[PDB]
């Protein structure tokens, strides 16, 4: 009963001027009891973390060019590129924050808020059954304004929301697939935020993000800690 988040095309080649166009879906409605609707759209560049596009649906974050414009209502959303060109190329993802767990689309290959600081632990290579504890330091903003979120990513399978912390009261809201073995914690006198992932497997393998965001949504990312998991 977790939300599923569908895109199409999957990949959609296009040449420098031309339009473009992608499609998300949900299988259930994106409208929150509250009147919002939480569509999110994110860009990830090759080697980058992802970048915020349109929050709730059609308003651009600050630096958006206005050819990116965001529509669709209920279970069916569209984003439009109109002047594509050479900085577009890359990974789009639909994100739906109305219902825990939040969810992303699959992505869709296509072939801002430069103060704000999020910077992580480097990467671990670790044995099945071990712990990682690893950091995102924050700064450039007010840690305590915002909320911060933690996000899978493996190789070729896209992203998965692990769940949210507060700072500011250290209240947390997670996903029942990380719940138990994914914690989160921080401390605000170094605006630090940790996440300690346990017992880890082989499938725990990915990077993993650390983002600011609202209560809803993320919008500027971390650049990601590298875990592996190997014997």
């Known amino acids: 009963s977790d939300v599923v988040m569908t895109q199409t095309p999957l990949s959609l080649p296009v040449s420098l001027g031309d339009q473009a166009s992608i499609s998300c879906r949900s299988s259930?409605?994106?409208?929150?009891?509250?009147?919002?609707?939480?569509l999110y759209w994110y860009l990830q560049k090759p080697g980058q973390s992802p970048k915020p596009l349109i929050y709730?649906?059609?308003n651009r974050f600050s630096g958006v060019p206005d050819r990116f414009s965001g529509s669709g209502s209920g279970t069916d959303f569209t984003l439009k590129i109109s002047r594509v060109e050479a900085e577009d190329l890359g990974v789009y993802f639909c994100?739906?924050?109305?219902?825990?767990?939040?969810?992303f689309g699959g992505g869709t290959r296509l072939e801002g808020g430069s103060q704000i600081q999020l910077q992580q632990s480097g990467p671990e290579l670790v044995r099945p059954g071990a712990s990682v504890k690893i950091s995102c330091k924050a700064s450039?903003?007010?840690?305590?304004?915002?909320?911060i979120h933690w996000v899978k990513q493996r190789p070729g399978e896209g992203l998965e929301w692990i769940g949210w912390?507060?700072?500011?009261?250290?209240?947390?809201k997670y996903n029942e697939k990380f719940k138990g073995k994914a914690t989160l914690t921080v401390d605000t006198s170094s605006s630090t935020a940790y996440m300690q992932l346990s017992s880890l497997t082989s499938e725990d393998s990915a990077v993993y993000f650390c983002?600011?965001?609202?209560?809803?949504?993320?919008?500027?990312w971390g650049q990601g800690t590298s875990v592996t998991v190997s014997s």
């Open positions: 259930q409605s994106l409208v929150h009891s509250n009147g919002n609707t939480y």
């Open positions: 983002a600011r965001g609202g209560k809803f949504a993320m919008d500027y």
């Open positions: 709730r649906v059609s």
């Open positions: 912390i507060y700072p500011g009261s250290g209240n947390t």
């Open positions: 994100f739906q924050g109305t219902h825990v767990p939040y969810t």
């Open positions: 450039g903003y007010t840690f305590t304004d915002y909320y």
